[PDB]
Amino acid sequence: GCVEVDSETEAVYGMTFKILCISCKRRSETNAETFTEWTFRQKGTEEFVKILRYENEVLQLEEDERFEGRVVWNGSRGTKDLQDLSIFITNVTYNHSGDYECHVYRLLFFENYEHNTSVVKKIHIEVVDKANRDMASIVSEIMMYVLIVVLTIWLVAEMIYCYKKIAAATETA
């Protein structure tokens, strides 16, 4: 169904990057119609400038300043229900580092009344120029080779313990 996954925080300069904003409704059976609103703070003081407004169908209204042509919608397409509002940056620069917020503005449709809600998800990304891989993809790759090598030495110690045991018991007979 719908799983809320957090976004990645390390971006690579010159490459592309995708910022996940997954907002799942509590009962997946209920109708809704949503839109959204992305705000972005630099490493500057305290501003949060609106950068886009994905309202509905394939129209996406954006472009105040600083980047036109390098932001693409990669969320839900042709639904109006939404539930996935992931932006996608082509050709990351060093001025895309900072703090992002997606504002989901749902409007639930019930059998007699309309109920307007709002969610905010906060995303903090970093532009580097050399992708550090992980920290659990270093420690677990070490611990695989450590466990494999220690388990063979647990055999070959025991294999040569018993091989010296049997030939010495042949000496006694």
């Binding site: 169904g1 009962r27 996935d84 019930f110 059998e111 790759e141 611990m143 091989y163």
Partner: protein
């Protein structure tokens, strides 16, 4: 004297034939609602015959004094009670409320007096109840202890609903309003919610508040102990229990599954096999007690014609040429299907005329061959002659198209294989007894089902039609009512199949809770006791270079060694427990994902480096002749194809993603390792050569009902729906396929199909498997009835008499087949026990030392240990505890401690809580004051006896359950943790059963049977575990429909060990299978994007779902039936070893 004359009429055997025709014509006039006014005299003529029988019996037995001796024979009490109450009706009714008509139904019990032999059966059906007294005390003690626990745990939880928040008699008129509750589409109860992070959550804009009406009609809740007695009685009998399972877990949360695992085991499965083993011990003693008493034109050239035809008949290769010609007829009918070309259709018209022409020409030669005098004497030739006649009657019509059950009677030629195949000969002998030697015990069964159809009709049938609108929102009658005769028969037939709770709610709503609990529980107790007896009766009459070698020697001692085996058994379980984490939440958690990707390469190195260590140690030929070592070799070889091709080449497409789903079989390595799983597997494998005899009959015998279904129902399940309002049109405007198809241009209209239908012999087999296990059978029956023709829109009750197709299959393909199946196993397990070196099956060698040391504990009894101390002050205390009236004091104080628990209720009073807290507080004081006056008086012997050890813990813990009530106020919220500590004062009640010897033997058998039953339970769990991982990888992303909600799903492993637990009781798998079966739009969507995953799509896979569920219904049926044999064969052994 006229008295000497009336004896000659009484004994005269034509008079007993005249009372027989009197009743059987009265039983037709009871069998009709709204009789015409031809009946007023006919009601009196029957009274004219029964009163003459009473005069002819009093005048025959003697004088006016004899009217006492006429009433000495207690079957005459019912003959006299008939004519008295009829006369009251005649005089007039003091109160004409008209439930006195059902006393006239007591005339149908005069058949027990008339028909010879039916009196001695009712005198034995009542005799097998006498032995049932001990079990009935225990099975009502245990429904009442479990009802206390259930009440305590879920009191008030079922009323929780999901209420919104107000747009500004304020509060209580906002709660009461049904516009503020949340209803799912097409449902008439409100959605049920939970406070926890575990139970169900309401949508945004709603709040899970406790106030409401309750589920169903309010007959489901757990408050008021009398309702928690019924809510847990539909768990013992397992009627629709998976709705009461999915309502307490939606309220109280999924962690309350532990309640139902104990009740489905300890209540619904152990207590049923005490009722099944005590009727069988009482039958098989009453059966044995009778055999003890039984022992103590050219006529001379026409003989040239006759003699040469008799040479063809006697010699073989025509008898072998007929039994081949039967099997090619039944394999020619089976290849009929619905979307079928007229060219393929005219093959099967021509091909079945030919096969009729063989068996007619073969039949008329036999009339010429011997003579028509000797030919009709032996049995099979009479059977052949009816089929040849019926197949020519059906051919000879050639005009009527509303009579096509007659082309399904040529299917019965498959029983001519009975003489060759000696297991199909047994299944004819089982059917043959119930018309023959046990044919009076089927008469009784038939009579009883006739009576409860009539009693139920006259009590409840007039009120279904006047109180319609309390049941159905259409204000038409429902599917299952009692307003007619045939429908009240179909209710009584459904109760014996086991589904009694759901047509009871309609009745209670319609008439009242007093009568509907009284009739529908007297059907079920009396009727299942006669069905059970018939079943038992059928069984009991069924059976009557020098250093290379040193190196190898050295390795061998590693593999045999005890640490190396304990090391790998620990690595099987981590490899298995690592499969549980592969749910849809694995894109969300990144740390456990990269751990299990690198741990997966550690484990396939251990299970290679122990394979190669085992080739060297054992041998290359001692390895490949093991067939357990084969089973480990295939699993490792799969994990190399997936590991090498992960690196390079053909990497992720097609047959490598398909080898990824075979990763679910890694738990099968554990089956070789545990000694308990091997003793069970070696015994279930010892039963396969005899099981495959029976399973070939059930495939053969259900293929007749499958082809009979395709002849009747193929093509007749399609129907046209208004897509927006979502109900099907009436016949008045859209009767045809070619008239729904001219309404496709408005886009409001769709021509669809029932999912599980009869378009093939394959799909017949899956429609017959839902009717046979009684889950899913209602949608099939509701549409089989409605059906009209090949492309025609159904109508609501055209074709009403079909239900008998499903009635005939359940008696034959289920009851008789079941009987055939059980009788094979018991004669299998007796010869596998006599023959086997191990005396007892299903126990290991280490357990039989635990077994015999546990049999000694229940056989020892002292009657002089331990005199007491001698003191003046301290020694006067034990003087009264030792007397008999101390225990009688406590045992009656402890049933009043039970009734102070039973009267507790949700939302009772502030004054009532304060009283019961004061009464419960003094029962701590006395039950402690009996403990101190026993412990200090019996200085050392208090801790000695195992009963008194149980007493001493309860005395301590009951005070703990009182002082903690301030500590819970000191702690957090408490619907959750305050309750569970108070469950341990129900442990006071247990000390109550210490007294009954009869019950202390029934518990003992269970204890004795505990080690054997643990060995199969490990196996059942192992197979639940493999199917839970194979469903989690396949059957997530399936569209949320009928049985797949939002809590009970295959999305995770908590969700899918819950779905697979409920199907072990075969319950509710029809709704888990129903959204798997759809693929391709509409009803399913390909390309649905699931957010936060890469797996695009919505659809289920209908070929893998059918293989999933039908494997597990067959496999777990075979496993659970072994657990019935293990319990029942132990109760016999305890009574034998007395």
């Amino acid at each position: 004297v006229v008295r000497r004359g009336a004896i000659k009429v009484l004994i005269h055997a034509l008079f007993s034939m005249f009372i027989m025709i009197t009743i059987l014509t009265n039983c037709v006039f009871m069998t009709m609602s709204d009789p015409p006014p031809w009946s007023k005299n006919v009601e009196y003529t029957f009274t004219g015959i029964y009163t003459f029988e009473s005069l002819i019996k009093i005048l025959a037995r003697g004088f006016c004094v004899d009217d006492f001796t006429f009433l000495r024979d207690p079957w005459n009490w019912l003959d006299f009670s008939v004519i008295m109450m009829a006369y009251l009706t005649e005089f007039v009714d003091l109160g004409n409320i008209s439930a006195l008509r059902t006393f006239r139904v007591l005339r149908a019990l005069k058949t027990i007096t008339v028909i010879p032999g039916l009196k001695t059966i009712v005198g034995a059906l009542i005799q097998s109840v006498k032995k049932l007294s001990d079990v009935m005390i225990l099975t009502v003690f245990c429904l009442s202890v479990f009802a206390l626990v259930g009440l305590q745990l879920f009191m008030g939880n079922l009323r929780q609903k999901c209420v919104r928040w107000p747009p500004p008699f304020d509060w209580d008129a906002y709660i009461s309003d049904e516009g503020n509750f949340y209803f799912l589409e097409g449902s008439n109860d409100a959605l049920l919610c939970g406070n926890s992070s575990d139970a169900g959550h309401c949508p945004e804009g709603y709040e899970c508040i406790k106030t409401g009406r309750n589920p169903n009609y309010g007959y489901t809740s757990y408050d008021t102990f009398s309702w928690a007695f019924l809510a847990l009685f539909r768990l013992m009998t397992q009627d629709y229990w998976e709705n009461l399972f999915q309502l307490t877990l939606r309220a109280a949360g999924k962690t309350y599954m532990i309640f139902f695992v104990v009740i489905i085991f300890l209540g619904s499965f152990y207590l049923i096999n005490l009722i099944l083993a005590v009727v069988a011990m009482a039958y098989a003693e009453q059966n044995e007690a009778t055999l003890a008493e039984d022992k103590e034109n050219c006529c001379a050239p026409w003989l040239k014609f006759k003699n040469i035809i008799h040479l063809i008949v006697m010699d073989p290769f025509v008898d072998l040429g007929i039994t081949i010609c039967i099997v090619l007829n039944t394999l020619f009918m089976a290849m009929e299907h619905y979307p079928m070309t007229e060219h393929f259709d005219n093959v099967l018209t021509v091909g079945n005329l030919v096969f009729t022409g063989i068996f007619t020409a073969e039949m008329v030669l036999k009339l010429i061959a011997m003579d028509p005098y000797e030919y009709f004497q032996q049995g099979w030739n009479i059977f052949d002659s009816i089929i040849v006649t019926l197949s020519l009657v059906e051919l000879g019509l050639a005009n009527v198209q509303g009579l096509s059950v007659l082309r399904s009677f040529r299917l019965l030629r498959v029983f001519k294989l009975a003489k060759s195949w000696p297991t199909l000969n047994m299944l004819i002998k089982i059917i043959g007894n119930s018309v023959g030697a046990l044919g009076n015990l089927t008469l009784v069964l038939a009579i009883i089902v006739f009576i409860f159809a009539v009693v139920g009709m006259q009590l409840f049938g007039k009120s279904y039609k006047e109180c319609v609108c309390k049941i159905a929102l259409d204000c038409n009658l429902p599917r299952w009512h009692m307003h007619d005769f045939f429908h009240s028969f179909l209710i009584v037939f459904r109760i014996l199949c086991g589904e009694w709770i759901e047509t009871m709610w309609d009745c209670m709503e319609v008439a009242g809770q007093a009568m509907c609990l009284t009739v529908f529980l007297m059907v079920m107790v009396i009727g299942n006791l006669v069905v059970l007896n018939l079943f038992l009766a059928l069984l009991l009459s069924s059976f009557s270079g020098k250093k290379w070698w040193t190196l190898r020697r050295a390795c061998f001692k590693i593999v045999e060694h005890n640490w190396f085996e304990t090391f790998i058994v620990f690595m099987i379980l981590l490899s298995s427990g690592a499969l549980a984490f592969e749910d849809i939440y694995i894109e969300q958690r990144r740390v456990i994902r990269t751990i299990l990707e690198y741990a997966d390469k550690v484990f396939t190195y251990i299970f290679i480096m122990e394979m190669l260590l085992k080739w060297v140690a054992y041998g290359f030929k001692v390895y490949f002749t093991n067939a357990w070592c084969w089973l480990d070799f295939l699993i490792v070889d799969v994990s190399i194809i997936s590991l090498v091709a992960n690196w390079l080449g053909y990497s992720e497409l097609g047959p490598i993603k398909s080898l990824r789903t075979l990763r679910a079989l890694r738990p099968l390595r554990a089956l070789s390792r545990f000694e308990g799983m091997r003793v069970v597997v070696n015994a279930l494998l010892g039963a396969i050569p005899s099981i495959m005899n029976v399973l070939l009959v059930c495939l053969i015998f259900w293929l007749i009902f499958s082809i009979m279904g395709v002849n009747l129902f193929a093509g007749k399940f399609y129907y046209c729906i208004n897509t927006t309002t979502s109900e099907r049109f009436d016949i008045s405007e859209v009767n045809n396929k070619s008239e729904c198809e001219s309404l496709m241009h408005t886009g409001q209209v769709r021509w669809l199909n029932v999912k599980v239908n009869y378009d093939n012999v394959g799909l017949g087999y899956l429609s017959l498997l839902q009717v046979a296990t009684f889950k899913g059978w209602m949608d099939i029956m509701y549409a089989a009835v409605d059906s009209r023709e090949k492309e025609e829109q159904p109508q609501y009750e055209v074709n009403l008499y079909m239900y008998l197709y499903f009635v005939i299959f359940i008696i034959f393909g289920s009851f008789f087949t079941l009987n055939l199946f059980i009788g094979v196993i018991i004669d299998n397990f007796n010869q596998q026990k006599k023959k086997l070196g191990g005396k007892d099956i299903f126990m290991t060698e280490e357990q039989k030392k635990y077994y015999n040391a546990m049999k000694k504990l229940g056989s020892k009894k002292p009657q002089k240990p331990i005199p007491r101390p001698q003191n003046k002050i301290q020694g006067m205390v034990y003087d009264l505890v030792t007397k008999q009236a101390f225990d009688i004091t406590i045992m009656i104080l402890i049933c009043l401690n039970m009734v102070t628990m039973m009267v507790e209720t949700d939302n009772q009073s502030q004054l009532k809580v304060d009283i019961l807290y004061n009464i419960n507080m003094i029962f701590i004081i006395i039950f402690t004051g009996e403990c101190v006056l026993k412990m200090l008086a019996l200085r050392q012997y208090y801790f000695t006896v195992g009963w008194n050890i149980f007493d001493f813990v309860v005395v301590i813990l009951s005070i703990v359950g009182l002082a903690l009530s301030d500590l819970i106020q000191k702690y957090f919220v408490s619907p959750t943790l305050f309750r569970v500590i108070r469950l341990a004062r129900i442990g006071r009640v247990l000390r109550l059963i210490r007294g009954a010897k009869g019950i202390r033997t029934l518990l003992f058998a269970l204890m004795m049977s505990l080690p054997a039953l643990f060995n199969i339970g490990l196996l059942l769990f192992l197979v639940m575990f493999i199917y839970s991982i194979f469903g989690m990888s396949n059957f997530a992303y399936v569209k949320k429909e009928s049985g797949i909600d939002d809590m009970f799903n295959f999305e995770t492993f908590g969700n899918s060990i819950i779905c697979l637990f409920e199907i072990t009781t075969s319950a509710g798998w029809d709704g888990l299978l129903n959204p798997i079966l759809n693929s391709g739009p509409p009803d399913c969507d390909p390309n649905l994007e699931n957010p936060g995953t890469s797996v695009k799509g919505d659809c289920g896979n209908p070929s893998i779902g059918i293989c999933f569920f039908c494997s597990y219904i067959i496999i777990s049926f075979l496993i659970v039936v072994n657990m019935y044999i293990a319990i029942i064969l132990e109760n016999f052994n305890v009574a034998t070893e007395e």
